[PDB]
Design a protein around this ligand. Structure first.
Ligand SMILES: CCCCCCCC/C=C\CCCCCCCC(=O)O[C@@H](COC(=O)CCCCCCCCCCCCCCC)COP(=O)([O-])OCC[N+](C)(C)C
Length: 289
């Protein structure tokens, strides 16, 4: 168990903040699904996320959920946490940092990626696209099962979304052509299978003409997705501190938070309430390496 209701000042159609019509829509969809033979992921949070993804259209949300359930069983997502071994992670992480550090003002996990060293040919030597997306699915289920529950216990309310920061420092804009396929697949996964899991998505240190580049990706992205994405130049600090306390924001990004050499520095640690024994529960500590 952990807090299951969003704060009351959150949007409607989120748990704890339903009107009678949203209520009836949730009970209807739940009954449809129970009739279909489903069992897992009939909790308020999940179903309201699919409803919200379809503006509370019951038949459309049901179709969404059913396709997602189908893909979970086709991809083997339900055991992926125990059946995927991303052994090449220490290699890829040196091109492509992907880490967490603490929480935002609403309790969301803060997730970071740095793209300035990503080189496609090198990682092509290290891995395949299919495995990188297996790892993406793996990190989604991991944040769901470990990070979000602890985050919810720490905030005192439900937390179901991430605060993501993606640093473009040092990318070459001409590189974007090379990753559309990957982005198309990643976004396809995030939108159809993890709906309503984005919270805020900053893009910092963006180089000039990047707003032009991002156009190549826009035909992949839901409008709800694009409304979450906030593109910034090198003046990102004030904006980040609006959303994350300085104590929780790494020093390289304008805040005051630090990680020691001992603990693996910023990249290799995984500091946050999902590491705190006060806030870990029946799910245990997140896998860590
Ligand atoms: C060799 C093998 C294959 C090769 C693959 C190589 C590709 C690798 C390289 C780079 C990958 C870059 C894109 C990755 C997409 C990340 C999105 C994501 O996580 O999903 C988000 C959906 O959000 C979207 O759908 C929006 C994505 C658009 C922004 C990306 C364009 C910037 C690229 C600039 C171009 C620079 C080019 C660089 C060159 C100097 C969800 O966000 P969230 O909920 O906050 O996150 C969930 C948290 N979790 C995931 C931890 C669970």
């Amino acid at each position: 168990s952990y807090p299951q209701n969003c704060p009351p000042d959150a949007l409607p159609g989120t748990p704890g903040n339903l009107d009678s019509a949203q209520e009836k829509a949730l009970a209807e969809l739940r009954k449809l699904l129970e009739d279909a033979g489903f069992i897992e992921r009939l909790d308020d949070s999940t179903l309201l996320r699919f409803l919200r993804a379809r503006k509370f259209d019951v038949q459309l949300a049901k179709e969404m959920f059913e396709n997602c359930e189908k893909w979970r069983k086709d991809y083997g997502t339900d055991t992926i946490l125990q059946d995927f071994h991303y052994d090449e992670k220490p290699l890829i992480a040196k091109f492509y940092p992907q880490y967490y550090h603490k929480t935002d003002k609403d309790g969301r996990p803060v997730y970071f990626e740095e793209l300035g060293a990503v080189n496609l040919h090198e990682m092509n030597k290290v891995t395949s696209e299919e495995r990188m997306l297996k790892n993406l699915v793996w990190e989604y289920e991991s944040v769901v099962q470990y990070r979000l529950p602890a985050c919810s216990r720490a905030a005192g309310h439900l937390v179901e979304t991430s605060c993501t920061i993606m640093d473009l420092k040092g990318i070459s804009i001409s590189s974007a052509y090379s990753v559309m396929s990957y982005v198309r697949e990643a976004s396809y996964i995030s939108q159809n299978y993890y709906p309503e899991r984005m919270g805020k998505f900053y893009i910092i240190n963006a180089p000039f003409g990047f707003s032009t580049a991002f156009r190549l990706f826009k035909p992949f992205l839901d409008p709800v997705t694009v409304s979450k994405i906030f593109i910034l130049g090198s003046s990102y600090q004030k904006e980040l501190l609006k959303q994350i306390p300085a104590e929780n924001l790494p020093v390289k990004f304008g805040g005051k938070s630090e990680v020691d050499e001992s603990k693996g520095g910023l990249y290799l640690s995984d500091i946050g309430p999902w590491r705190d024994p006060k806030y870990i529960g029946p799910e245990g500590e997140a896998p860590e390496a």
